[PDB]
Design a protein around this ligand. Structure first.
Ligand SMILES: COc1ccc(C(=O)n2c(C)c(Cc3cccc(O[C@@H](C)C(=O)O)c3)c3cc(OC(F)(F)F)ccc32)cc1
Ligand SMILES: COc1ccc(C(=O)n2c(C)c(Cc3cccc(O[C@@H](C)C(=O)O)c3)c3cc(OC(F)(F)F)ccc32)cc1
Ligand SMILES: O=C(Nc1ccncc1)c1cc([N+](=O)[O-])ccc1Cl
Ligand SMILES: O=C(Nc1ccncc1)c1cc([N+](=O)[O-])ccc1Cl
Lengths: 248, 259
């Protein structure tokens, strides 16, 4: 019934607002008419004075990137549990859906903070030019570049938060994660989410044909770059004890 | 609102179940004979000890008891570290403090979780499939004949409170979020979180144990016992480092063992 799908869509959007402090609406405002910009080395070390952070440079930026991801994982976990029927699944399965899902969702939402020329950082207090990041030493200079390419493609679909809120729910409820014990309910929820997302895209983007389909195709792009992302970390194993424990 | 607190109690229980595979519930079942779980091999002498390698999954004996148990400590730290990240606000804190809160919280959380595996006669070992008796341990060599006994005495006193895993989960969190740790940069946001956790604990206790007069207060005092356990532990550890310089401490434990 289209009435309840519209309710599901509003429920998730409200939960997403609570779970994610820096919305896409907010990020896009900041990128388009003031956050300190980081375009080279001098601007960076200036930027710890302006925007306060935690305790060489290529590695320091990589690491602080992990910090944020751990922060992100908690936001996604908290959002995940507001998905109807999620907490009711077998606890191991919830843990399995998150394990394989948080990456795909992080890159999805990193797209909201990026454009052609760089990426907002630190709750949007900052902006890191895309040029400075590729200026970084091999292989560091090559880490965020593949994401920039995915983001600009992805942002071309002109999704808003209310779209993204359902979309990422769909990501979490993937019935093909290894090690799932009871896939019936997982796929039951996903189809519901898929319905809500199909209607949402229609009402919210009437003039955009088959956007639903085009969006589902991007989940190919996501899983590809997630694979390629883990293998890029697994050439930086070619490189505290509690810190490595907090970030494993 | 009470409703915000129950929600926090549930979230914490939920992560606790996800991060610690041997709950107190599983452990009380093994320790009584419940047919939800199968029965442990008991070790009480060197002979029983020695078929236990054939029986249950796993250099003289008292040393590699201490070594086996040592690597078990490491795994626990990882789980507590895993648990800590689920604590609303913990990973947003300053990174130097996160390390700080772990550095001091972790042993107070071990002996709390280790109590779950103990009775007045011994301790489950090897994920539950073993049971090493108190006496056997107390009878080990001159230095290694005093490791476990104080944790036994705490565990006996502590298990008196009759907490379950859903209580422990909040209380384990209150331990981590201790602003009074040495070297904390921003004590203040730490204490807004603990202030909240303690509110959650209070409610959870009053509801889960509606007859246990002052369980909350009584439970906060048990943090006193915990801190004394850690100090006797650490100093007795430096004996071993000097008795047996052939013996190595795992680095993650060695870093926690600072100050
Ligand atoms: C809910 O999902 C997200 C929440 C936060 C963020 C976020 O702020 N990030 C930003 C701005 C970034 C980009 C970035 C670049 C340089 C330093 C960064 O760390 C600090 C400055 C920070 O952003 O707080 C962050 C980011 C990277 C991340 O790891 C990666 F995706 F690469 F696997 C994860 C989250 C990241 C992204 C997704
Ligand atoms: C809350 O997290 C945990 C706390 C304790 C344990 C745990 O299993 N332990 C057990 C059963 C023990 C008890 C024990 C005694 C002898 C050998 C042991 O190790 C092997 C043989 C095993 O566990 O199978 C384990 C234990 C001891 C520890 O070191 C100490 F803190 F005491 F210095 C640490 C953890 C220990 C696991 C998780
Ligand atoms: O990938 C990065 N961080 C991680 C770490 C662990 N898990 C997921 C993401 C990263 C690397 C760089 N860099 O400068 O190479 C810049 C920004 C972010
Ligand atoms: O304390 C012990 N292990 C360590 C070591 C260092 N850091 C933390 C925990 C221990 C020792 C014995 N024992 O009888 O030798 C038995 C059980 C546990």
């Amino acid at each position: 019934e289209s009435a309840d799908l519209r309710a599901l869509a509003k429920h998730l959007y409200d939960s997403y607002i609570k779970s994610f402090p820096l919305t896409k609406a907010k990020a896009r405002a900041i990128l388009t008419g003031s956050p300190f910009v980081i375009y080279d080395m001098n601007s960076l070390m200036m930027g710890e004075d302006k925007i306060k952070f935690k305790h060489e440079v290529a590695i320091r930026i990589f690491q602080g990137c992990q910090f944020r991801s751990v922060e992100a994982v908690q936001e996604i976990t908290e959002y995940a549990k507001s998905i109807p029927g999620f907490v009711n699944l077998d606890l191991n399965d919830q843990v399995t859906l998150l394990k394989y899902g948080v990456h795909e969702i992080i890159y999805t939402m990193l797209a909201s903070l990026m454009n052609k020329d760089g990426v907002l950082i630190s709750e949007g207090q900052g902006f890191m030019t895309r040029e400075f990041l590729k200026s970084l030493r091999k292989p560091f200079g090559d880490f965020m570049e593949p994401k920039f390419e995915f983001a600009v493609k992805f942002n071309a679909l002109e999704l808003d938060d209310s779209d993204l809120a359902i979309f990422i729910a769909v990501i979490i409820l993937s019935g093909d994660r290894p090690g799932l014990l009871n896939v019936k309910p997982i796929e039951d929820i996903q189809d519901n989410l898929l319905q809500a997302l199909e209607l949402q895209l229609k009402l919210n983007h009437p003039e955009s044909s088959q956007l639903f389909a085009k969006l589902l195709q991007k989940m190919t792009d996501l899983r590809q770059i997630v694979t390629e992302h883990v293998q890029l970390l697994q050439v930086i194993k070619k490189t505290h004890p509690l810190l490595q424990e907090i970030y494993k």
